[PDB]
């Protein structure tokens, strides 16, 4: 039915990673003494198996990232409370409490945006000591030490409500990551086996799932 | 020396033993000095 | 004839910092290193060799890559099997950069499983390349078929592929050389059961920086 | 050999040589061999 | 391709005395004389043919060399064996000038042992060439190997080698053609046991002087 050719602008390596999707959800639950009042989130893209399967088609990747924080309350009614979205660069210590001294360090760039405002958007550059992110490392950093590369660290965010005397909110931050200026160098086949762990390629060899669904005989094309 | 790198591969109905014969001579810069009778 | 990995003809490092300096060794290290011949049978299941792990503790390259903490080199790989006109089968000879052995059973692999040495280890599940990644799509890598009714040799020339222009030759292994029989070996009764597979490695443009002891 | 019988005369000798092998198997047979020469200071190799 | 004995391309006699005179026969005598085919087996041990004894009493050359008391000629020798690709072995085809059969047992050899005729005799001890002289050094003579996995034919072109430019073709035999299997013949069960070896002789520049009867 289709006679013409489609567009080649939509198959490129920058449009395949273009749109921003959900990458992580954290919860604060401020209020009282037994509750913490803060919530950190290590930046990683291998959290959800839909972005993990797309980025493990390649070995070396180089990109920027811009973030957007959609915070609501537990029900939805947002009264104006001032928040703080900090950023701990790799090599700096994470906060230990809602009133610790890591919140006032001037080298951690924080963002002060209320609940009633549009969501706080900010951009993070290429933060690796190498010249490309590696998602497959065949070596040791010197059992559980094989295949770990510390050149993929990007940072945390540590959401916190700015107040004095323990407001009783229960918030929920949703983080949306957009990949910009994407460059991918060497390709590799897409994974067929289901995932077992988050940082390792383990695949549960006791049941090898097949890459093609079965049919009756080899001589019938109807499947 | 003379080492086996890969084992001796034959098709069916072909004998499995063979032989190598070794040869040897001197090059152009080979010279000789003071004469002497041989020891048979 | 030859397969050229990503169309590069590997070269030396251009104008990098922290080197004025690294030694460029002569043909004392760039000779032909012939490893052992692996016997391919009916129930055989594949092999893999890690680079430059197969040339550590071996000759001049072993005495240089163990006493230097920078390393950059490209290789020339020559896999050849000697079969008659009465045997049949096919081999897939590919070069996988950053080839990570997974680990099986729902459990991380040992040291000799991922760094096998000169005697390269054998696959347990060649259908998923022991990494959950199918052999059906493993022709992305620079590959060459060894079909026993057409050819016997396969030559792949691999450059240096890494995000850092100098690493250590002991901790990090850049790529792996798989040889997997896709079609099994069959022969009539009376022929030679095992067919050898010999591999010759010649380093092209090796560099070493910073000497120890 | 011929080079080794005319030098049971001629007390001293010095020069280069060559050793030629040839194989006398069937046309269908296939294999490999490694032909290694060690210098006169060393003994013969114990491994391949 | 061809082996040329001592690099000569044999010619006629230059300006000798007592010939003004000798007849130079045409291609009626310079045709291709094909002798019998000798069957080479596992326990075979070699053969030798004396020249020009093999072409006495045979054709036009027999009627000329028996009725002339001077003789000078050079030959072209073509030894060829017909084997399949399942047989194996090697032959040493050499040309020995003034090849003297010794005699054994601490006892002179007979007439048919040293002058065998067209059916050339077989060796008793090929290791010492039946003359106390080892086969190990028998590559001084103009030789060519017939290795059954490489070639089948061997061509040697022999000039006239003698201290006198004219002798009798009946009493004196100038050279001998040995064919000795250095490596024995082996074959799998079912193949042809005996492999023939055929020889073709073409005289080049024959001369005859002085006619009888």
XYZ file of C-alpha atoms in Angstrom:
737
model
C 0.000 0.000 0.000
C 2.853 2.367 0.859
C 4.676 3.470 -2.299
C 6.913 6.366 -1.169
C 9.914 6.587 1.165
C 9.696 7.854 4.741
C 11.959 10.400 6.429
C 15.584 9.771 7.367
C 15.559 12.497 10.036
C 13.757 10.265 12.546
C 16.199 7.311 12.464
C 19.259 9.319 13.509
C 21.250 8.717 16.683
C 20.145 12.025 18.247
C 16.407 11.505 17.700
C 16.516 7.907 18.967
C 17.482 9.276 22.403
C 15.595 12.551 22.014
C 12.490 12.717 24.269
C 12.440 12.978 28.037
C 10.980 10.157 30.114
C 10.796 9.182 33.765
C 14.105 8.031 35.227
C 13.525 8.088 38.989
C 10.989 8.707 41.778
C 11.847 9.648 45.379
C 9.757 10.485 48.454
C 10.355 12.939 51.307
C 7.670 12.433 54.022
C 8.630 15.435 56.124
C 7.335 15.833 59.661
C 8.305 14.805 63.158
C 11.457 13.189 64.501
C 11.332 9.580 63.252
C 11.133 10.793 59.635
C 14.160 12.010 57.699
C 12.916 14.988 55.681
C 15.256 14.653 52.684
C 15.626 12.281 49.739
C 18.711 11.692 47.596
C 18.866 10.042 44.177
C 22.022 8.753 42.484
C 22.032 9.725 38.806
C 21.942 6.598 36.659
C 20.200 5.814 33.383
C 20.202 2.033 33.925
C 17.211 2.103 36.258
C 14.355 1.281 33.909
C 14.703 -1.550 31.390
C 13.445 0.531 28.460
C 16.323 3.027 28.528
C 18.729 0.263 29.586
C 17.989 -1.858 26.504
C 18.443 1.165 24.213
C 21.762 2.321 25.685
C 23.289 -1.175 25.841
C 23.052 -1.306 22.052
C 26.285 0.732 22.157
C 29.432 0.707 24.288
C 30.724 4.302 24.310
C 28.284 7.196 24.704
C 28.817 10.936 25.181
C 25.916 13.221 26.034
C 24.586 16.137 28.031
C 21.561 15.786 30.297
C 18.863 18.226 31.386
C 16.479 17.466 34.230
C 12.960 18.465 35.257
C 11.473 17.868 38.707
C 7.693 17.386 38.880
C 6.758 17.458 42.577
C 3.220 17.042 43.898
C 1.841 16.412 47.370
C 0.207 13.134 48.386
C -3.254 14.322 47.298
C -2.365 17.109 44.864
C -3.273 20.393 46.549
C -0.081 22.449 46.364
C 0.255 25.279 48.865
C 3.376 27.445 48.337
C 6.293 25.866 50.195
C 9.862 26.655 49.174
C 11.981 23.686 48.079
C 15.690 23.110 47.499
C 17.046 20.919 44.692
C 20.768 20.740 45.356
C 23.416 19.063 43.175
C 26.333 17.126 44.651
C 29.074 16.799 41.978
C 31.085 13.538 41.890
C 33.706 13.671 44.625
C 31.631 15.702 47.119
C 29.837 14.240 50.172
C 26.087 13.704 50.295
C 23.986 15.304 53.062
C 23.366 13.424 56.295
C 20.296 15.268 57.603
C 17.821 17.997 56.773
C 19.819 20.510 58.859
C 23.361 19.338 58.081
C 26.132 21.624 56.863
C 26.203 20.134 53.346
C 23.129 22.220 52.491
C 25.068 25.490 52.878
C 28.198 24.550 50.912
C 28.396 27.090 48.087
C 30.016 24.632 45.645
C 26.821 22.544 45.452
C 24.546 24.435 43.011
C 21.042 24.421 44.499
C 17.717 25.628 43.098
C 15.027 27.372 45.191
C 11.610 26.849 43.550
C 8.231 26.793 45.317
C 5.557 24.124 44.882
C 3.162 26.401 42.975
C 5.759 27.355 40.345
C 6.310 25.536 37.032
C 8.850 22.707 37.466
C 12.514 23.519 38.056
C 14.525 22.684 34.936
C 18.333 22.586 34.929
C 21.073 21.086 32.735
C 24.081 18.924 33.629
C 27.181 18.671 31.370
C 29.444 15.735 30.469
C 30.860 14.654 33.832
C 33.327 11.854 33.115
C 37.128 11.683 33.494
C 37.324 9.715 30.231
C 36.067 10.960 26.856
C 32.998 8.658 26.710
C 30.742 6.818 29.126
C 31.456 3.084 29.191
C 28.582 0.711 29.865
C 30.679 -2.446 29.342
C 34.058 -2.587 31.102
C 36.143 -5.761 30.755
C 38.489 -5.262 33.666
C 39.044 -4.561 37.341
C 39.286 -1.184 39.122
C 42.424 -2.257 41.026
C 33.895 -11.655 42.549
C 31.800 -8.507 42.975
C 34.562 -6.191 41.691
C 34.462 -7.383 38.065
C 33.065 -4.968 35.504
C 32.723 -1.820 37.624
C 33.753 1.499 36.074
C 33.824 4.575 38.365
C 34.025 6.894 35.318
C 30.204 6.977 35.058
C 29.436 8.996 38.202
C 27.268 12.070 37.711
C 25.920 13.094 41.120
C 22.837 13.293 43.348
C 20.137 15.896 43.908
C 18.931 15.664 47.570
C 15.481 17.272 47.474
C 14.610 19.227 50.640
C 11.880 21.653 51.708
C 13.272 24.927 53.071
C 11.621 25.713 56.408
C 12.439 26.022 60.103
C 9.995 24.032 62.237
C 9.090 20.801 60.423
C 6.197 21.301 58.018
C 4.034 18.190 57.715
C 4.218 17.626 53.948
C 4.467 14.278 52.152
C 5.918 15.008 48.713
C 6.891 12.920 45.687
C 9.551 14.033 43.203
C 9.540 12.676 39.649
C 12.743 13.188 37.659
C 12.615 13.501 33.860
C 15.899 13.227 31.943
C 16.464 14.448 28.383
C 19.563 13.259 26.516
C 21.164 15.962 24.366
C 24.071 15.876 21.870
C 24.249 12.081 21.832
C 27.255 10.372 20.226
C 27.509 6.562 20.160
C 30.567 4.840 18.736
C 30.609 1.010 18.512
C 27.361 -0.990 18.270
C 26.523 -4.388 19.731
C 23.515 -6.748 19.568
C 20.350 -6.070 21.527
C 19.818 -8.245 24.597
C 17.391 -11.168 24.280
C 17.585 -12.640 27.787
C 15.699 -10.948 30.646
C 17.594 -8.937 33.227
C 18.556 -10.371 36.617
C 20.599 -7.598 38.271
C 21.056 -3.869 37.725
C 24.824 -3.596 37.164
C 25.626 -7.047 35.768
C 24.799 -8.997 32.580
C 23.579 -12.123 34.454
C 20.931 -14.072 32.576
C 19.845 -17.268 34.482
C 21.180 -20.015 32.196
C 18.812 -22.639 33.685
C 16.108 -21.326 31.312
C 17.342 -19.864 28.020
C 14.444 -18.007 26.442
C 14.388 -18.099 22.664
C 14.559 -15.170 20.260
C 11.796 -16.431 17.939
C 8.380 -17.841 18.778
C 7.697 -21.387 17.663
C 5.683 -22.749 14.745
C 4.438 -26.198 13.766
C 6.777 -27.258 10.945
C 9.579 -25.725 8.888
C 7.593 -26.179 5.657
C 4.581 -23.977 6.531
C 5.002 -20.206 6.354
C 1.829 -19.568 8.390
C 2.859 -18.725 11.950
C 64.112 -29.316 16.526
C 60.851 -30.337 14.862
C 57.586 -29.874 16.768
C 53.963 -30.842 16.141
C 51.917 -27.674 15.731
C 48.746 -29.453 14.560
C 48.064 -33.193 14.478
C 48.208 -35.201 11.259
C 44.784 -34.989 9.588
C 43.708 -37.605 7.023
C 40.439 -38.354 5.191
C 38.973 -41.882 5.322
C 40.772 -44.579 3.300
C 44.197 -42.891 3.469
C 47.204 -44.170 5.471
C 48.043 -42.363 8.685
C 51.848 -42.589 8.653
C 54.244 -40.543 6.533
C 57.919 -39.581 6.484
C 60.117 -36.491 6.327
C 63.609 -36.741 4.837
C 66.125 -34.101 5.904
C 68.762 -32.520 3.673
C 71.672 -30.194 4.294
C 74.532 -28.261 2.722
C 76.770 -25.263 3.354
C 76.302 -21.720 2.085
C 78.590 -19.578 -0.068
C 80.583 -18.115 2.857
C 81.713 -21.542 4.111
C 85.511 -21.887 4.214
C 88.071 -24.460 5.339
C 91.567 -24.391 6.832
C 94.588 -26.618 7.665
C 94.639 -30.027 5.956
C 94.533 -33.339 7.830
C 94.017 -36.973 6.877
C 90.579 -38.427 7.500
C 89.611 -40.869 10.251
C 87.708 -43.105 7.771
C 40.853 -11.685 1.759
C 41.321 -9.699 4.981
C 38.714 -8.087 7.225
C 39.657 -4.629 8.463
C 38.065 -3.731 11.797
C 36.054 -0.495 11.303
C 38.343 0.697 8.467
C 41.262 2.140 10.453
C 44.898 0.810 9.784
C 45.945 1.507 13.404
C 48.522 4.208 14.095
C 50.484 5.833 16.895
C 49.129 8.364 19.378
C 48.749 11.910 17.994
C 50.248 14.694 20.144
C 48.855 13.566 23.506
C 49.774 15.194 26.808
C 51.986 13.651 29.562
C 54.313 12.269 26.839
C 56.854 15.106 26.327
C 58.494 9.886 25.627
C 56.873 6.378 25.357
C 59.016 3.661 23.852
C 58.158 2.296 20.407
C 59.570 -1.250 20.389
C 60.990 -2.821 17.240
C 60.313 -6.214 15.578
C 61.686 -8.011 18.647
C 58.129 -7.674 19.988
C 56.266 -7.412 16.643
C 56.995 -10.986 15.529
C 54.423 -13.746 14.950
C 53.177 -15.288 18.205
C 51.610 -18.687 17.479
C 49.397 -19.997 20.281
C 48.305 -23.593 20.822
C 46.027 -25.452 18.423
C 42.574 -26.206 19.822
C 40.976 -29.492 18.779
C 37.508 -28.976 17.291
C 35.264 -32.039 17.648
C 31.606 -32.950 17.140
C 30.482 -31.913 20.640
C 32.715 -28.831 20.792
C 31.078 -25.561 21.738
C 33.393 -22.596 21.071
C 36.341 -20.683 22.478
C 37.294 -17.131 23.400
C 40.609 -15.348 23.995
C 41.057 -12.034 25.820
C 43.490 -9.416 24.474
C 46.149 -8.487 25.475
C 45.812 -11.225 28.103
C 46.986 -13.979 25.743
C 50.353 -12.260 25.241
C 51.020 -11.402 28.866
C 53.840 -13.451 30.492
C 54.902 -14.587 26.994
C 58.170 -13.451 25.443
C 59.172 -9.824 24.983
C 55.550 -8.617 25.162
C 55.190 -10.203 28.592
C 58.273 -8.429 29.931
C 57.021 -5.072 28.595
C 53.304 -5.164 29.449
C 53.979 -6.238 33.048
C 56.583 -3.529 33.748
C 54.708 -0.608 32.170
C 51.581 1.135 33.430
C 50.579 2.680 30.095
C 49.742 0.620 27.017
C 48.394 1.138 23.495
C 48.573 -1.370 20.641
C 46.740 -2.835 17.686
C 46.811 -6.424 16.521
C 46.637 -8.674 13.465
C 44.699 -11.895 14.021
C 45.069 -14.944 11.760
C 42.867 -17.957 12.563
C 43.381 -21.051 10.407
C 42.087 -24.625 10.633
C 43.490 -27.592 8.691
C 40.750 -29.886 7.379
C 40.560 -32.285 4.448
C 37.946 -32.368 1.677
C 35.857 -34.951 3.565
C 35.078 -32.821 6.640
C 32.418 -30.128 6.821
C 31.318 -27.315 9.096
C 31.545 -23.584 9.662
C 33.230 -21.294 12.186
C 32.290 -17.746 13.186
C 35.430 -15.726 13.951
C 34.458 -12.338 15.389
C 36.156 -9.606 17.427
C 34.066 -8.235 20.300
C 35.329 -5.029 21.974
C 34.747 -4.916 25.756
C 33.565 -8.535 25.852
C 32.131 -9.027 29.348
C 31.470 -12.549 30.612
C 28.160 -12.424 32.465
C 27.803 -15.173 35.034
C 25.023 -17.741 35.136
C 22.360 -19.211 37.390
C 19.990 -16.494 38.708
C 26.904 -15.678 41.147
C 29.802 -13.800 39.495
C 32.386 -15.568 37.296
C 35.851 -16.405 38.547
C 39.173 -14.924 37.524
C 40.170 -17.773 35.196
C 36.746 -17.675 33.519
C 37.041 -14.038 32.409
C 40.874 -13.847 32.150
C 41.686 -17.318 30.788
C 45.281 -16.787 29.685
C 46.910 -18.350 26.651
C 44.673 -21.413 26.941
C 41.426 -19.582 26.228
C 38.319 -20.941 27.900
C 35.289 -22.575 26.290
C 31.706 -21.363 26.159
C 28.949 -22.849 28.290
C 26.066 -21.335 26.288
C 27.303 -20.207 22.854
C 23.756 -19.360 21.727
C 23.758 -16.320 24.043
C 27.575 -15.743 23.877
C 27.711 -16.269 27.701
C 26.473 -12.677 28.064
C 22.713 -12.840 27.429
C 23.366 -11.487 23.928
C 22.389 -13.665 20.946
C 24.747 -15.164 18.383
C 22.098 -14.475 15.712
C 23.058 -10.779 15.657
C 26.779 -11.249 16.415
C 27.712 -10.250 12.835
C 27.837 -6.574 13.818
C 31.423 -7.143 14.917
C 34.272 -7.470 12.377
C 33.818 -11.089 11.366
C 34.771 -13.673 8.754
C 33.323 -17.121 8.108
C 35.529 -20.188 7.892
C 33.463 -22.567 5.764
C 35.374 -25.806 5.224
C 34.364 -26.151 1.552
C 35.427 -22.603 0.613
C 38.343 -21.355 2.741
C 40.445 -22.170 5.796
C 41.989 -18.886 7.010
C 40.470 -15.677 8.368
C 42.445 -12.463 8.890
C 41.145 -9.600 11.052
C 43.198 -6.440 11.697
C 42.012 -4.686 14.863
C 42.975 -1.123 15.897
C 43.037 0.313 19.420
C 39.440 1.016 20.483
C 39.128 2.718 23.875
C 37.811 5.924 25.432
C 41.219 6.587 27.049
C 44.337 6.607 24.806
C 46.491 4.793 27.415
C 45.465 2.094 29.907
C 47.136 -0.768 31.756
C 47.609 -4.054 29.913
C 47.040 -6.167 33.049
C 43.743 -4.925 34.498
C 41.805 -3.936 31.358
C 41.320 -6.251 28.369
C 40.254 -4.328 25.284
C 38.571 -6.976 23.126
C 37.951 -10.686 22.755
C 38.332 -13.144 19.891
C 35.504 -15.671 19.679
C 35.574 -18.777 17.473
C 32.228 -20.593 17.586
C 31.142 -23.521 15.387
C 27.691 -22.486 14.178
C 27.280 -25.630 12.093
C 28.677 -28.777 13.756
C 31.447 -31.005 12.452
C 30.472 -34.208 10.644
C 32.679 -36.852 9.050
C 32.421 -40.413 7.805
C 33.930 -43.218 9.865
C 37.684 -43.495 9.344
C 38.583 -39.805 9.090
C 40.484 -37.784 11.674
C 38.211 -36.953 14.609
C 39.828 -33.736 15.870
C 40.662 -30.817 13.569
C 43.156 -28.249 14.923
C 42.631 -24.483 14.941
C 45.836 -22.434 15.147
C 46.028 -18.680 15.784
C 48.843 -16.245 14.959
C 49.062 -12.796 16.593
C 51.334 -9.984 15.383
C 51.225 -6.648 17.253
C 51.373 -3.647 14.933
C 51.988 -0.332 16.718
C 52.621 -1.138 20.373
C 53.577 1.658 22.776
C 54.652 1.496 26.417
C 55.139 4.326 28.893
C 56.706 4.461 32.339
C 59.044 1.692 33.479
C 59.058 -0.282 36.730
C 61.862 -1.827 38.817
C 76.259 -36.014 4.264
C 78.648 -34.506 1.734
C 79.528 -31.380 3.724
C 80.356 -33.535 6.764
C 82.655 -36.025 5.028
C 84.959 -33.599 3.206
C 85.555 -31.900 6.572
C 86.944 -34.941 8.278
C 89.874 -33.430 6.433
C 90.455 -29.650 6.838
C 90.922 -29.108 10.615
C 89.049 -25.781 10.912
C 85.810 -24.631 9.290
C 83.444 -21.677 9.671
C 80.426 -20.628 7.644
C 76.683 -20.651 7.161
C 74.533 -23.695 6.379
C 70.961 -24.553 5.505
C 68.773 -27.571 6.263
C 65.986 -28.497 3.844
C 63.036 -30.670 4.845
C 60.505 -32.222 2.498
C 57.330 -34.139 3.259
C 56.469 -37.535 1.783
C 52.814 -38.029 2.650
C 49.663 -38.332 0.609
C 48.205 -35.424 -1.341
C 45.060 -35.482 0.825
C 46.875 -35.108 4.168
C 47.092 -31.779 5.993
C 48.958 -30.607 9.070
C 51.574 -28.242 10.450
C 55.082 -28.414 11.883
C 57.256 -25.965 13.800
C 60.927 -25.853 12.789
C 62.934 -24.027 15.461
C 66.682 -23.397 15.621
C 68.373 -22.582 18.924
C 71.679 -20.660 19.129
C 74.806 -22.680 20.039
C 74.906 -21.294 23.586
C 71.551 -22.774 24.603
C 70.278 -26.328 24.949
C 67.269 -27.709 23.116
C 63.850 -26.354 24.157
C 61.758 -28.483 26.495
C 58.432 -26.954 25.413
C 56.942 -25.789 22.138
C 60.878 -28.623 -15.106
C 63.866 -30.377 -16.700
C 67.239 -31.252 -15.192
C 70.185 -30.589 -17.486
C 73.170 -32.842 -16.803
C 76.193 -30.591 -16.057
C 74.812 -27.734 -18.209
C 75.822 -28.904 -21.697
C 73.071 -29.302 -24.472
C 75.041 -32.107 -26.188
C 76.503 -31.495 -29.638
C 78.429 -33.191 -32.420
C 82.159 -33.892 -32.432
C 84.352 -30.846 -33.179
C 87.024 -31.353 -35.867
C 88.378 -34.694 -34.635
C 90.958 -36.735 -36.527
C 90.312 -40.051 -38.383
C 86.981 -38.626 -39.651
C 87.953 -36.916 -42.953
C 82.931 -39.149 -42.473
C 80.694 -40.611 -39.669
C 77.015 -40.900 -40.450
C 74.544 -38.606 -38.691
C 71.250 -40.535 -38.702
C 67.902 -38.775 -39.007
C 64.692 -39.063 -36.924
C 64.328 -42.715 -37.958
C 66.620 -43.409 -34.986
C 65.842 -40.280 -32.905
C 62.234 -41.238 -32.126
C 60.781 -41.975 -28.674
C 61.706 -45.450 -27.413
C 59.302 -46.471 -24.635
C 60.545 -49.367 -22.504
C 58.448 -51.605 -20.267
C 56.662 -50.348 -17.163
C 58.099 -51.665 -13.899
C 55.635 -52.354 -11.091
C 56.603 -50.552 -7.878
C 55.265 -52.269 -4.746
C 55.694 -52.026 -0.974
C 58.692 -54.385 -0.795
C 60.308 -53.090 -3.994
C 63.941 -52.077 -3.802
C 65.019 -50.152 -6.921
C 66.091 -50.587 -10.525
C 68.945 -49.607 -12.820
C 69.366 -49.446 -16.604
C 72.684 -49.320 -18.471
C 73.106 -47.005 -21.479
C 73.320 -47.581 -24.404
C 72.655 -51.212 -23.460
C 68.883 -50.718 -23.218
C 68.680 -49.660 -26.877
C 70.922 -52.355 -28.300
C 69.083 -55.019 -30.378
C 66.032 -52.708 -30.465
C 64.885 -51.051 -33.675
C 67.081 -48.858 -35.852
C 69.484 -48.107 -32.978
C 70.126 -51.823 -32.541
C 71.003 -52.282 -36.210
C 73.405 -49.310 -36.092
C 75.179 -49.798 -32.750
C 75.909 -53.473 -33.477
C 77.370 -52.867 -36.956
C 79.549 -49.866 -36.073
C 82.725 -49.795 -33.996
C 82.618 -46.077 -33.175
C 79.786 -44.457 -31.234
C 78.921 -41.085 -29.696
C 75.469 -39.965 -28.558
C 73.538 -38.065 -25.931
C 70.143 -38.936 -24.534
C 66.922 -37.484 -23.137
C 65.446 -39.476 -20.258
C 61.801 -39.157 -19.181
C 60.710 -41.231 -16.168
C 57.029 -41.036 -15.222
C 54.868 -42.979 -12.763
C 51.054 -42.969 -12.711
C 49.657 -42.828 -9.174
C 46.391 -41.558 -7.725
C 45.922 -39.039 -4.906
C 45.669 -41.823 -2.302
C 49.168 -43.281 -2.779
C 52.358 -41.836 -1.330
C 56.104 -42.233 -1.651
C 59.195 -40.800 -3.292
C 61.602 -41.895 -6.023
C 65.214 -40.838 -6.583
C 65.969 -40.686 -10.315
C 69.691 -40.081 -10.846
C 72.190 -40.535 -13.683
C 75.498 -42.112 -12.650
C 78.347 -41.975 -15.208
C 80.566 -45.094 -15.231
C 78.261 -46.958 -12.841
C 80.192 -50.081 -11.821
C 78.353 -52.931 -10.107
C 80.645 -54.189 -7.356
C 79.950 -57.775 -6.382
C 79.070 -58.977 -2.901
C 80.083 -61.454 -0.223
C 83.756 -60.987 0.794
C 82.989 -63.175 -6.209
C 82.506 -61.019 -9.335
C 79.042 -60.260 -10.773
C 77.708 -62.025 -13.833
C 77.075 -60.642 -17.292
C 73.313 -60.211 -16.857
C 73.844 -58.468 -13.507
C 75.988 -55.662 -14.946
C 74.547 -55.638 -18.513
C 70.861 -56.337 -17.814
C 69.348 -55.399 -21.168
C 65.985 -53.749 -21.686
C 64.610 -55.410 -18.551
C 66.903 -53.604 -16.126
C 67.877 -55.493 -12.999
C 66.951 -54.734 -9.393
C 69.187 -53.719 -6.513
C 70.161 -56.091 -3.724
C 71.419 -53.379 -1.342
C 70.088 -49.965 -2.421
C 71.524 -48.293 0.696
C 75.048 -48.693 -0.728
C 73.959 -48.547 -4.433
C 75.432 -52.088 -4.892
C 78.869 -50.441 -5.106
C 79.852 -49.694 -1.493
C 78.883 -46.061 -2.106
C 76.061 -44.574 -0.006
C 72.708 -43.348 -1.282
C 72.901 -40.511 1.276
C 75.371 -38.624 -0.944
C 73.974 -39.800 -4.306
C 72.584 -36.305 -5.037
C 75.880 -35.248 -6.622
C 74.631 -36.756 -9.871
C 72.010 -34.981 -12.029
C 68.869 -35.958 -10.158
C 65.186 -35.144 -9.739
C 62.739 -36.267 -7.064
C 59.415 -37.841 -7.954
C 57.283 -37.100 -4.894
C 53.774 -38.465 -5.405
C 52.037 -35.438 -3.844
C 53.906 -32.882 -5.984
C 54.838 -34.274 -9.416
C 54.950 -37.460 -11.477
C 57.520 -36.914 -14.259
C 61.269 -36.292 -14.211
C 63.271 -35.224 -17.269
C 67.076 -35.484 -17.408
C 69.069 -34.556 -20.536
C 72.478 -36.253 -20.515
C 75.394 -35.363 -22.838
C 78.261 -37.627 -23.900
C 80.711 -37.891 -20.986
C 83.863 -39.876 -21.782
C 87.634 -39.441 -21.947
C 87.667 -40.738 -25.551
C 85.363 -39.057 -28.123
C 84.457 -42.385 -29.808
C 84.015 -45.827 -28.224
C 82.096 -49.012 -28.979
C 78.440 -49.181 -27.968
C 78.604 -52.903 -27.107
C 81.553 -53.240 -24.720
C 81.470 -49.903 -22.861
C 78.351 -48.518 -21.163
C 78.688 -44.811 -20.456
C 76.187 -44.215 -17.647
C 73.361 -45.771 -15.676
C 69.866 -44.633 -14.742
C 68.877 -45.543 -11.189
C 65.330 -45.278 -9.823
C 65.254 -46.056 -6.096
C 62.288 -45.614 -3.730
C 63.792 -43.783 -0.759
C 60.460 -43.603 1.047
C 58.331 -46.757 0.674
C 54.892 -47.013 -0.890
C 51.869 -47.055 1.419
C 48.176 -47.236 0.565
C 44.887 -47.999 2.265
C 43.181 -51.324 1.611
C 41.275 -51.313 -1.676
C 43.663 -49.254 -3.810
C 45.810 -50.556 -6.650
C 48.801 -52.451 -5.260
C 51.315 -51.985 -8.092
C 52.097 -48.577 -9.605
C 53.820 -48.593 -13.021
C 56.947 -46.618 -13.907
C 57.419 -45.979 -17.633
C 60.575 -44.593 -19.261
C 60.973 -42.846 -22.626
C 64.387 -42.469 -24.304
C 65.090 -40.158 -27.253
C 68.660 -40.016 -28.620
C 69.756 -36.496 -29.529
C 72.992 -36.348 -31.544
C 73.973 -39.928 -32.337
C 76.989 -40.601 -34.563
C 78.294 -43.870 -35.994
C 81.551 -44.552 -37.811
C 82.800 -47.539 -39.777
C 80.342 -50.124 -41.083
C 80.450 -53.917 -40.825
C 79.240 -56.712 -43.135
